[PDB]
Design an enzyme around this catalytic site. Structure first.
Site, PDB file in Angstrom:
ATOM      1  N   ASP A   1      -7.065   8.552  -5.286  1.00 52.87           N
ATOM      2  CA  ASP A   1      -7.329   7.132  -5.426  1.00 52.87           C
ATOM      3  C   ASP A   1      -7.331   6.772  -6.913  1.00 52.87           C
ATOM      4  O   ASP A   1      -7.170   7.648  -7.765  1.00 52.87           O
ATOM      5  CB  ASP A   1      -8.704   6.860  -4.830  1.00 52.87           C
ATOM      6  CG  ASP A   1      -8.844   5.480  -4.338  1.00 52.87           C
ATOM      7  OD1 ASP A   1      -7.849   4.961  -3.798  1.00 52.87           O
ATOM      8  OD2 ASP A   1      -9.948   4.924  -4.472  1.00 52.87           O
TER       9      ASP A   1
ATOM     10  N   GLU B   1       0.790  -1.223   0.000  1.00 52.47           N
ATOM     11  CA  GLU B   1       0.000   0.000   0.000  1.00 52.47           C
ATOM     12  C   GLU B   1       0.823   1.274   0.000  1.00 52.47           C
ATOM     13  O   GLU B   1       0.386   2.283  -0.542  1.00 52.47           O
ATOM     14  CB  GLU B   1      -0.929   0.034   1.220  1.00 52.47           C
ATOM     15  CG  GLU B   1      -2.026  -1.017   1.243  1.00 52.47           C
ATOM     16  CD  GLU B   1      -3.136  -0.745   0.226  1.00 52.47           C
ATOM     17  OE1 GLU B   1      -2.993   0.186  -0.598  1.00 52.47           O
ATOM     18  OE2 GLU B   1      -4.152  -1.474   0.256  1.00 52.47           O
TER      19      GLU B   1
END
Length: 164
Positions: free
Chosen positions: A20, A11
């Protein structure tokens, strides 16, 4: 290597608000702030979580506090879920990290949907579980990450995260 190093690799840990893959403002390790196009709304939700006027930039300690909480949520979601819990109870420490990694990425409900692969994991059929997971929509979306997680479920070791 542990679940925190594993997730940091997959991540990453961003210290400033970023977008995003769907345009959602986010921070830390895939920590959603808002779904609206407004940066102000993003900054505002961050400050309520941090407790100061971050203006879109936080410290490492604050980023890791967010991270630690989200990892804790992923673990809670597994223990409170009727399908995940029994699988998790049966796994060794390394494979457990792989289950947490998936829940963290997709949510307890999403992972709970892999009923066949889960049953496979529970019966210790690593090779079959791997092949079944390799042909999922999840794998297709995030190939590199999914491959590392599958390899972990398969081998029970951290080789996919040490040979990068």
């Amino acid at each position: 290597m542990n679940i925190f190093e594993m997730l940091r690799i997959d991540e990453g840990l961003r210290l400033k608000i970023y977008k995003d893959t769907e345009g959602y403002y986010t921070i830390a390790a895939a920590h959603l702030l808002t779904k609206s196009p407004s940066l102000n709304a993003a900054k505002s939700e961050l400050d309520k979580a941090i407790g100061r006027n971050t203006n879109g930039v936080i410290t490492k300690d604050e980023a890791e506090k967010l991270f630690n909480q989200d990892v804790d949520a992923a673990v809670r979601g597994i223990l409170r879920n009727a399908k995940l819990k029994p699988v998790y109870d049966s796994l060794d420490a390394v494979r457990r990290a792989a289950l947490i990694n998936m829940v963290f990425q997709m949510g307890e409900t999403g992972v709970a949907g892999f009923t066949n692969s889960l049953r496979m994991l529970q019966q210790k059929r690593w090779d079959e579980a791997a092949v079944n997971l390799a042909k999922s929509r999840w794998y297709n979306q995030t190939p590199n990450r999914a491959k590392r997680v599958i390899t972990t479920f398969r081998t029970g070791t951290w080789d996919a995260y040490k040979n990068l």
